[PDB]
Amino acid sequence: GAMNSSNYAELFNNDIKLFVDDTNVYRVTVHKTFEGNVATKAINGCIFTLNPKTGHLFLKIIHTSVWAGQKRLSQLAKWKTAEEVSALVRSLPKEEQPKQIIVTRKAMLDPLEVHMLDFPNIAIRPTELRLPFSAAMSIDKLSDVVMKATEPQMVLFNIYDDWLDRISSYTAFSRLTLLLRALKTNEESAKMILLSDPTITIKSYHLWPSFTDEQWITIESQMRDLILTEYGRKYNV
Amino acid sequence: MNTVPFTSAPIEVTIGIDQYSFNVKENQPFHGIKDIPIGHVHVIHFQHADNSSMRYGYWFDCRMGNFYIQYDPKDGLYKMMEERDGAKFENIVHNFKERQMMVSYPKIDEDDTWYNLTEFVQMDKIRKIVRKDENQFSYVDSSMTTVQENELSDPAHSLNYTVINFKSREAIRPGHEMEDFLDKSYYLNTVMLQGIFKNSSNYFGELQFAFLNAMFFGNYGSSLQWHAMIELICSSATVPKHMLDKLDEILYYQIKTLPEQYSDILLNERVWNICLYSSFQKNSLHNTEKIMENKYPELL
Ligand SMILES: CN(C)S(=O)(=O)Nc1ccccc1Br
């Protein structure tokens, strides 16, 4: 069934699973035309496919060329997502294929189920959680590779950097969703928090800064404060 | 005209013949139904006064034999049987007719309802859905499940309807996932019409038979089958014009005949709104849309 607060620890057991988030697949800017009408211009997108246990992120870059001459792009985007996830699964050795795929939006269920008919034993599941993966494009190195791409491309990342050397995947996922929730609520504040101290850098092979344990605790507190404030700033409290 | 005589009526029962029905009291001198139109299939069905559970009945065609009903007090139901001694059967039908102990199939001459509900229904196809090859007639009841239902437990007593499944490899060509799921024309026309049913008449016949099992026996899997066959046409962008026109007529008479009080259980809101308002065929079922809007506007 659906993934929710009650079956949360399932994400960190030893059954391979992937989250698929399609929010950033079809992205546009809206502008005015010379005649004063409105038009869209597509920009590069990505599928965010994540193993929450290991941190392995399969970032499939969606080049604007895939929309050329297509109609009903928002609907196509869901099917293209499904096609690419299915291709990913087929590319993996059998013992690395997921047992479950959890989609962050219910509209992906039918597209993915149909594309995965060859894998009847892979469960396709929705979730009741309001996960902040749309904020993945607020991570500078992920946005950078997406925007620079000139052709379809798969880029592999570990979204937890080296954290799993020191914390569990439950804790690593909690940190990730806090960071992303913060970046979604107030990107500028969130980014200020992460980079304010110039002496704490981001290694070339990492996405986030090289905080010590104590520094992560301070960071995490600042992100929680940010989120609660914006909640007030927004509902007036 | 054909006759289905009855050995006796030992238990109180509501007897249906096609869309007609009458109450028979316990041990009432009732000995069957005469003047049955030749050339159509028919269904004779039963609901005991003591048990509105289990509506049950028999699909038959008078051209395929002489049939009669006798109550079985061990199995506790009215059973259809065959008498191959034609002389003896004609003789038994004549005396009952002389003593006037038979009800007359009460067809109004202007009335084409039964023809319109059974236009494409064939006894030979019914016998492949309801497999009991030693009889020429076919027993159905409220509780029988369908093959597709059993897959998701006794197969001999199952309804072997053609399995339709929109999220199956049969429905979806590799490489045309989105195309074939949003426009089911290839599944309708190539897989089902050309491949399995051979022609649209056999398709419509199964569709009509599922509806009638749903209406007369409240058979849930039959309702599922009727809606699935409707939905497959309504979700196809490319359907022969003659099929659309005939479907509109088929569905019109089905909606017309449905009891006004059973619309809540026998009509799937989702499928009907798709056919009438969202689907490719939203503009192509004029008669069906008019009767649905005027008779069951709540459902929509
Ligand atoms: C004469 N009988 C009343 S019976 O024998 O019980 N009924 C019967 C037998 C064969 C054919 C039709 C009938 Br009705």
Swiss-Prot record, chain A:
Localization: Nucleus
Region named RNase H homology domain: 7-237
Result, substituting residue 21 to N: Reduced growth at 30 degrees Celsius. Strongly reduced growth at 16 degrees Celsius
Effect seen on changing residue 21 to A: Alters protein folding. Severely impaired growth. Strongly reduced growth at 35 degrees Celsius
Effect upon mutating residue 104 to A: Reduced growth at 30 degrees Celsius. Strongly reduced growth at 16 degrees Celsius
Description of how the protein assembles with itself and partners: Component of the U4/U6-U5 tri-snRNP complex composed of the U4, U6 and U5 snRNAs and at least PRP3, PRP4, PRP6, PRP8, PRP18, PRP31, PRP38, SNU13, SNU23, SNU66, SNU114, SPP381, SMB1, SMD1, SMD2, SMD3, SMX2, SMX3, LSM2, LSM3, LSM4, LSM5, LSM6, LSM7, LSM8, BRR2 and DIB1.
Function recorded in the entry: Functions as a scaffold that mediates the ordered assembly of spliceosomal proteins and snRNAs. Required for association of BRR2 with the spliceosomal U5 snRNP, and the subsequent assembly of the U4/U6-U5 tri-snRNP complex. Functions as a scaffold that positions spliceosomal U2, U5 and U6 snRNAs at splice sites on pre-mRNA substrates, so that splicing can occur. Interacts with both the 5' and the 3' splice site, as well as the branch region. Has a role in branch site-3' splice site selection. Associates with the branch site-3' splice 3'-exon region. Also has a role in cell cycle.
Further remarks about this protein from its record: Present with 468 molecules/cell in log phase SD medium.
Entry note about domains: The MPN (JAB/Mov34) domain has structural similarity with deubiquitinating enzymes, but lacks the residues that would bind the catalytic metal ion. Contains a region with structural similarity to reverse transcriptase, presenting the classical thumb, fingers and palm architecture, but lacks enzyme activity, since the essential metal-binding residues are not conserved.
Identification of the protein by name: Pre-mRNA-splicing factor 8
Originating species: Saccharomyces cerevisiae (strain ATCC 204508 / S288c) (Baker's yeast)
Lineage of the organism: Eukaryota, Fungi, Dikarya, Ascomycota, Saccharomycotina
Record gene name: PRP8
UniProtKB/Swiss-Prot annotation, chain B:
Keywords: Cytoplasm, mRNA processing, mRNA splicing, Nucleus, Phosphoprotein
GO biological process terms, semicolon-separated: spliceosomal snRNP assembly; spliceosomal tri-snRNP complex assembly
Primary subcellular site in the record, as a coarse category: cytoplasm
Family: Belongs to the AAR2 family.
Name this protein carries in UniProt: A1 cistron-splicing factor AAR2
Renumbered residue ranges of the record's region Leucine-zipper: 244-265
Role played: Component of the U5 snRNP complex that is required for spliceosome assembly and for pre-mRNA splicing. Involved in splicing pre-mRNA of the A1 cistron and other genes that are important for cell growth.
Other remarks in the entry: Present with 7330 molecules/cell in log phase SD medium.
A Pfam cross-reference name: AAR2_1st
Organism: Saccharomyces cerevisiae (strain ATCC 204508 / S288c) (Baker's yeast)
Lineage, top ranks: Eukaryota, Fungi, Dikarya, Ascomycota, Saccharomycotina
Coiled-coil spans in chain: none
Phenotype for residue 236 to D/E: Disrupts interaction with PRP8
